[PDB]
């Protein structure tokens, strides 16, 4: 199989994992664990990479790095990246828009003073999401009725964002419908329910959000109602 | 012409600007100025965008947003994105690796306590760059002897990084050779020396680095030599 390295985190790779699955493609993962980072430094220069970074993708021919480079390579192999220039460009538009929410969590995630940051980013969230809620206007998926790589990306993004505020998605039904429809894939279904599936962490174990070492209780403030009532 | 919006900043668009030039492609820019941001909000929802964000690219057919989506669309139109899947994937590997340095400046740029941040990021710089200095091993450019979209990207990245520490590039000759070779293009040459060329800011005018409103003197510390001597 094509060999793939990452940390035992959802992180950047979750979407390529998801995509690898849905294609019924034999792949072998190289999963580094928090302590294991020792093992990384040595192999960091050995396995003939050109831009040695994680996540990596070893194959017969291709010897790749860079998260987009990996995903696009699987979907491209498969005829999913698009036919006609303009379409191919729309796909990456979707990709880009996706990666703002998911990279948006990333760019806050580790900052100690998360609590305060969360606020500002979340303020903007409803706008970013409406974009998709609107693009899901009489669509099964992002870019018509077939899956595309960015569908799993909005999925890793939505999966991520629910961990900030589980309620954030109630204002956008079609998005919730989207998450239900993705998982309804027999391939998505069985996966999320297997040994292989990395359910956490969401970020590197150092991270203030989607981090620590185990699935998330509070670390916060709620707001719910005036004095001592409503505590989500 | 295909119409393109941004701020009167180098920023994200500098590379698409550079690429648009080298292709001898008629384009009309829509450049918003610092005060002008008023004009943005109204047109933000009017001009039939799907993911209304800056930079935008209006054409006959395509109505696009997202910085990668724009660049890749010009080069794709032109047969530059790659022939065979693996190659196309290497291109975006290059793209990705590029965008770590350039996004690396971005993610520090605005933080008030730049001075301190700069340190850490710069620490890592020589590693990131060696990658390219090595990939320039008996190459004219990134990915052989033809230009590719990422060549302008390493250019916008190197152009950017010299503004932190002008010396950072002395350890990597081939990179300096690269910058000389890019600019040697009659199209790059004439451009950088025209009315059209946005020489500054580098970031949004709010930014602590590559910002303010005008080309950069100090705001810093040097280190040069022990007590009061060597002040770069
Ligand atoms: N922009 C990322 C580059 C990767 C990244 O910055 N690396 C992380 C992923 S969690 C890693 O932990 N890097 C360790 C390293 O430098 O060796 C991509 O496209 O994959
Ligand atoms: N990730 C960027 C998205 C753009 C971005 O975050 N926008 C900046 C570029 S300086 C802008 O100022 N945005 C204003 C807006 O939200 O309308 C891309 O691919 O183009």
Swiss-Prot record, chains A, B:
Q: Which organism is it from?
A: Schistosoma japonicum
Extract the SUPFAM superfamilies matched here. Answer: GST C-terminal domain-like (SSF47616), Thioredoxin-like (SSF52833)
Keyword terms: Transferase
Disulfide bond positions:
none
Domain GST C-terminal stretches: 84-202
Q: What else is known?
A: There are at least two isoenzymes of GST in S.japonicum.
Recorded catalytic reaction(s): these are: RX + glutathione = an S-substituted glutathione + a halide anion + H(+)
What's this protein's name? Answer: Glutathione S-transferase class-mu 26 kDa isozyme
Q: What Pfam families does this protein's entry cite? A: GST_C_3, GST_N
What Gene3D superfamilies does the entry give?
A: 1.20.1050.130
* Reported function: Conjugation of reduced glutathione to a wide number of exogenous and endogenous hydrophobic electrophiles. GST isoenzymes appear to play a central role in the parasite detoxification system. Other functions are also suspected including a role in increasing the solubility of haematin in the parasite gut.
By its UniProt entry, which InterPro entries does this protein fall under? Answer: Glutathione-S-Trfase_C-like, Glutathione-S-Trfase_C_sf, Glutathione_S-Trfase, Glutathione_S-Trfase_N, GST_C, GST_superfamily, Thioredoxin-like_sf
List positions binding substrate.
Answer: 110
Concerning its family, UniProt says: Belongs to the GST superfamily. Mu family.
Q: Where is the GST N-terminal domain?
A: 1-82
What terms describe the molecular function in GO for this protein? glutathione transferase activity
Q: Which positions bind glutathione?
A: 6-7, 40-44, 53-54, 66-67
One Gene Ontology term of the biological-process aspect is: glutathione metabolic process
What EC number is given for this enzyme? 2.5.1.18
Quaternary structure, per UniProt, is: Homodimer.
């Amino acid at each position: 199989s094509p060999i793939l390295g990452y940390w035992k985190i959802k992180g950047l790779v979750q979407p390529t994992r998801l995509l690898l699955e849905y294609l019924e493609e034999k792949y072998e993962e190289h999963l580094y664990e928090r302590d294991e980072g020792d093992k990384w430094r040595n192999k960091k220069f050995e396995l003939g990479l050109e831009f040695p970074n994680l996540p990596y993708y070893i194959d017969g021919d291709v010897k790749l790095t860079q998260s987009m480079a990996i995903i696009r390579y699987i979907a491209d192999k498969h005829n999913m990246l698009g036919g006609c220039p303009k379409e191919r460009a729309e796909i990456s538009m979707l990709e880009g828009a996706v990666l703002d929410i998911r990279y948006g969590v990333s760019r806050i995630a580790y900052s100690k003073d998360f609590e305060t940051l969360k606020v500002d980013f979340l303020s903007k969230l409803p706008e970013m999401l409406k974009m998709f809620e609107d693009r899901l206007c009489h669509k099964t998926y992002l870019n018509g009725d077939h899956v595309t790589h960015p569908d799993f990306m909005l999925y890793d993004a939505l999966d991520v964002v629910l961990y900030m505020d589980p309620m954030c998605l109630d204002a956008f039904p079609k998005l919730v419908c989207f998450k239900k429809r993705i998982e309804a894939i027999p391939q998505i279904d069985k996966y999320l329910k297997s040994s292989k599936y990395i359910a956490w962490p969401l970020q590197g174990w150092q991270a203030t959000f989607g981090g620590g070492d185990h699935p998330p209780k509070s670390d916060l403030v709620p707001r719910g109602s005036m004095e001592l009532d409503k505590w989500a």
